[PDB]
Write an enzyme that holds these catalytic residues in place. Structure first.
Site, mmCIF file in Angstrom:
data_model
loop_
_atom_site.group_PDB
_atom_site.id
_atom_site.type_symbol
_atom_site.label_atom_id
_atom_site.label_comp_id
_atom_site.label_asym_id
_atom_site.label_seq_id
_atom_site.Cartn_x
_atom_site.Cartn_y
_atom_site.Cartn_z
ATOM 1 N N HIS A 45 -10.558 -10.770 4.943
ATOM 2 C CA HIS A 45 -10.113 -10.322 6.271
ATOM 3 C C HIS A 45 -10.354 -8.843 6.573
ATOM 4 C CE1 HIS A 45 -6.033 -9.281 4.492
ATOM 5 N NE2 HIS A 45 -6.121 -8.326 5.399
ATOM 6 N N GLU A 59 -10.179 8.515 -5.421
ATOM 7 C CA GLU A 59 -9.395 9.037 -4.319
ATOM 8 C C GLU A 59 -7.881 9.124 -4.575
ATOM 9 O OE1 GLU A 59 -9.244 10.988 -2.154
ATOM 10 O OE2 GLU A 59 -10.177 10.242 -0.333
ATOM 11 N N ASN A 61 -5.642 11.798 -2.071
ATOM 12 C CA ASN A 61 -5.197 12.249 -0.755
ATOM 13 C C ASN A 61 -6.335 12.002 0.231
ATOM 14 O OD1 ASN A 61 -4.778 13.910 1.603
ATOM 15 N ND2 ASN A 61 -3.185 14.995 0.459
ATOM 16 N N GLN A 64 -7.613 15.506 2.077
ATOM 17 C CA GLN A 64 -8.005 16.728 1.386
ATOM 18 C C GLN A 64 -8.979 16.433 0.267
ATOM 19 O OE1 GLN A 64 -3.444 18.128 1.902
ATOM 20 N NE2 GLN A 64 -4.442 18.799 -0.001
ATOM 21 N N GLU A 69 -13.543 12.624 -6.062
ATOM 22 C CA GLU A 69 -14.087 11.547 -5.244
ATOM 23 C C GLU A 69 -15.590 11.361 -5.282
ATOM 24 O OE1 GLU A 69 -12.620 14.353 -4.184
ATOM 25 O OE2 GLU A 69 -11.096 13.967 -2.713
ATOM 26 N N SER A 188 -3.940 -4.144 2.473
ATOM 27 C CA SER A 188 -4.808 -5.324 2.377
ATOM 28 C C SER A 188 -6.056 -5.087 1.534
ATOM 29 C CB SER A 188 -5.269 -5.768 3.777
ATOM 30 O OG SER A 188 -4.262 -6.288 4.670
ATOM 31 N N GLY A 189 -6.418 -6.091 0.736
ATOM 32 C CA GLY A 189 -7.607 -6.007 -0.089
ATOM 33 C C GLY A 189 -7.427 -5.268 -1.395
HETATM 34 C C1 LIG Z 1 -3.643 -5.466 5.752
HETATM 35 O O1 LIG Z 1 -3.481 -4.449 5.072
HETATM 36 C C2 LIG Z 1 -2.482 -6.453 5.963
HETATM 37 N N1 LIG Z 1 -2.707 -7.905 5.978
HETATM 38 C C3 LIG Z 1 -2.534 -8.505 7.170
HETATM 39 O O2 LIG Z 1 -2.147 -7.926 8.191
HETATM 40 C C4 LIG Z 1 -2.820 -10.008 7.173
HETATM 41 C C5 LIG Z 1 -4.231 -10.320 7.648
HETATM 42 C C6 LIG Z 1 -4.203 -11.125 8.917
HETATM 43 C C7 LIG Z 1 -2.752 -11.255 9.337
HETATM 44 N N2 LIG Z 1 -1.976 -10.672 8.193
HETATM 45 C C8 LIG Z 1 -0.601 -10.584 8.054
HETATM 46 O O3 LIG Z 1 -0.039 -10.130 7.048
HETATM 47 C C9 LIG Z 1 0.221 -11.127 9.237
HETATM 48 N N3 LIG Z 1 0.692 -12.494 8.918
HETATM 49 C C10 LIG Z 1 0.348 -13.527 9.720
HETATM 50 O O4 LIG Z 1 -0.436 -13.395 10.658
HETATM 51 C C11 LIG Z 1 0.974 -14.828 9.427
HETATM 52 C C12 LIG Z 1 1.240 -15.723 10.520
HETATM 53 C C13 LIG Z 1 1.823 -16.978 10.259
HETATM 54 C C14 LIG Z 1 2.184 -17.323 8.921
HETATM 55 C C15 LIG Z 1 2.985 -18.559 8.619
HETATM 56 O O5 LIG Z 1 4.145 -18.502 8.192
HETATM 57 N N4 LIG Z 1 2.335 -19.761 8.822
HETATM 58 C C16 LIG Z 1 3.111 -21.012 8.989
HETATM 59 C C17 LIG Z 1 2.310 -22.146 9.623
HETATM 60 O O6 LIG Z 1 1.380 -21.702 10.623
HETATM 61 C C18 LIG Z 1 0.628 -20.496 10.378
HETATM 62 C C19 LIG Z 1 0.877 -19.896 9.000
HETATM 63 C C20 LIG Z 1 1.840 -16.456 7.833
HETATM 64 C C21 LIG Z 1 1.263 -15.200 8.087
HETATM 65 C C22 LIG Z 1 1.439 -10.201 9.507
HETATM 66 C C23 LIG Z 1 0.974 -8.764 9.756
HETATM 67 C C24 LIG Z 1 2.232 -10.713 10.717
HETATM 68 C C25 LIG Z 1 -1.317 -6.114 4.978
HETATM 69 C C26 LIG Z 1 -1.472 -6.855 3.658
HETATM 70 C C27 LIG Z 1 0.017 -6.445 5.614
HETATM 71 C C28 LIG Z 1 -4.876 -5.572 6.873
HETATM 72 F F1 LIG Z 1 -4.839 -6.789 7.467
HETATM 73 F F2 LIG Z 1 -6.186 -5.333 6.472
HETATM 74 C C29 LIG Z 1 -4.709 -4.526 7.953
HETATM 75 F F3 LIG Z 1 -5.015 -3.362 7.403
HETATM 76 F F4 LIG Z 1 -5.534 -4.764 9.006
HETATM 77 F F5 LIG Z 1 -3.413 -4.557 8.319
HETATM 78 CA CA LIG Z 2 -9.312 13.216 -1.157
#
Ligand SMILES: *[C@](=O)([C]([N]C(=O)[C]1[C][C][C]N1C(=O)[C]([N]C(=O)C1=[C][C]=C(C(=O)N2[C][C]O[C][C]2)[C]=[C]1)[C]([C])[C])[C]([C])[C])C(F)(F)C(F)(F)F
Ligand SMILES: [Ca+2]
Length: 240
Positions: A45, A59, A61, A64, A69, A188-189
């Protein structure tokens, strides 16, 4: 990372910052794990849209120069075949990035250790999540690398109705859920480092949190289980 604290400089040498070209500058968008001198593992994603990416190793900060890095462009993106952009709960949230050049391994830049295929962690296993993500639900990104202790919640408990129910699959790892500590946007990731027999190994790739917020009781941060994708990872690296 919510409920954590700043990490010691370069204490998690496999952690990378994934950044995209925001016109004039570069902006952190996700974390990742360096697994080969020229390969990075992250969430699907994070890279399923057409942007120009770069990886920063050594990395600490984001604003800075720390003097440790190395900046390198992303040459090829390989997203898992089963991944669907609009369905994070289905799983398969993993991708591999081939770097434009190999980075130089040293004290500040090291490969993350991957678990043996099929490995399952016992409940309450000691793990740590690291990242530059929001430090509070709807807060702001951290300038410096943060870390938080996030023990695992086994599958049987995590897939129970009071927790995540059927939303979590056995191809995922849950950790945290105490309402105090968790991953959050920007994490994320990134890696979930777990201490197994004296050594830290990367057991998870930060995937998602609940719609209720980042740190929510009984709603652990959900990770892609790395040990479920070992064959795929090896095949991709060998064919590219
Ligand atoms: C990142 O750092 C973050 N990850 C996310 O934001 C991920 C990727 C896409 C959406 N998401 C979430 O954590 C979101 N969760 C949901 O959208 C979600 C909806 C529904 C359900 C659920 O219970 N279900 C039941 C049955 O039907 C559907 C599924 C689960 C999850 C959340 C933000 C609302 C972090 C790890 C948080 C990133 F994505 F890369 C970012 F940097 F872009 F944020
Ligand atoms: Ca730095």
């Amino acid at each position: 990372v919510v409920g954590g604290t700043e990490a010691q400089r370069n204490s998690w040498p496999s952690q990378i910052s994934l950044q995209y070209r925001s016109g004039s500058s570069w902006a952190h968008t996700c974390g990742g794990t360096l697994i080969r001198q020229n390969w990075v593992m992250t969430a699907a994603h994070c890279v399923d849209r057409e942007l120009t990416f770069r990886v920063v190793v050594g990395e600490h900060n984001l604003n800075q120069n720390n003097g440790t890095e190395q900046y390198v462009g992303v040459q090829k993106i390989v997203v898992h075949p089963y991944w669907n952009t609009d369905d994070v709960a289905a799983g398969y949230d993993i991708a591999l990035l081939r770097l434009a050049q190999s980075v130089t391994l040293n004290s500040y830049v090291q490969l993350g250790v991957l678990p043996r295929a099929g490995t399952i962690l016992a409940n309450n296993s000691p793990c740590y999540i690291t990242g530059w993500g929001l430090t509070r639900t709807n807060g702001q990104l951290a300038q410096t690398l943060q870390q938080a202790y996030l023990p695992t919640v086994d599958y049987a408990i995590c897939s129970s109705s009071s927790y995540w129910g059927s939303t979590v699959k056995n191809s995922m790892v849950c950790a945290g859920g105490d309402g105090v500590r968790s991953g959050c946007q920007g994490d994320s990731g990134g890696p979930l480092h777990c201490l197994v027999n004296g050594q830290y190994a990367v057991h998870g790739v930060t995937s998602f949190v609940s719609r209720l917020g980042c740190n929510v009781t009984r709603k652990p941060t959900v990770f892609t289980r790395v040990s479920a994708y070992i064959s795929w990872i090896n095949n991709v690296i060998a064919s590219n």
